[PDB]
Ligand binder design. Structure first.
Ligand code: HEM
Length: 153
């Protein structure tokens, strides 16, 4: 399974493709948003904006991009337990920016494709796989947390 090697690989590749903090975060955020405008909606953060250029290269956007980029770092690293202070994020989302269904799947997917494309020319099939699979893992964890000791019912 996934294992050490796999994990490392994914992690590194990610890290490499990512490298560009600001850009990285912003791009991801924008896509997600335009991808799943549901995102736009949830965002009370920014919404005066809602167009091509606006998302393309927006102040706030970029700002969030970094935070986004940065955070994931941990989750994947632990290369055993992205549970750094991942709980924190989880709680956060639970309360405000909930893990709205497919939302995360989308995020994950988009991020995946984005990266590979950006700083290839890995795509290394095996690599692509983990990457996506990795996001999957993350997602599963967060939700379990949420439902079972976050709110749930
Ligand atoms: C891997 C995915 C995500 C990571 C690691 C993440 C992380 C962060 C972080 C570290 C914060 C700073 C405050 C807090 O914590 O909450 C933030 C805030 C926030 N995120 Fe996320 N985020 C992700 C996904 C999402 C998604 C998918 C959305 C909505 C679909 C979302 C909506 C928010 C909102 C609304 C805030 C606060 C808005 C504001 O700041 O103003 N986030 N997120």
């Amino acid at each position: 399974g996934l294992s050490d090697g796999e994990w490392h690989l994914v992690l590194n590749v990610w890290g490499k493709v990512e490298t560009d903090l600001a850009g990285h975060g912003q791009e991801v955020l924008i896509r997600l948003f335009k991808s799943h405008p549901e995102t736009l909606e949830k965002f009370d953060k920014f919404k005066h904006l809602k167009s091509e250029d606006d998302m393309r290269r927006s102040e706030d956007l970029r700002k969030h991009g970094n935070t986004v980029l940065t955070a994931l770092g941990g989750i994947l690293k632990k290369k055993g337990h992205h549970e750094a202070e991942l709980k924190p994020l989880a709680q956060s989302h639970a309360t405000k920016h909930k893990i709205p269904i497919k939302y995360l799947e989308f995020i994950s997917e988009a991020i995946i494709h984005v990266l590979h494309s950006k700083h290839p020319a890995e795509f290394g099939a095996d690599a692509q796989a983990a990457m996506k699979k990795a996001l999957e893992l993350f997602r599963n964890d967060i939700a379990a947390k949420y439902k079972e000791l976050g709110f749930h019912g």
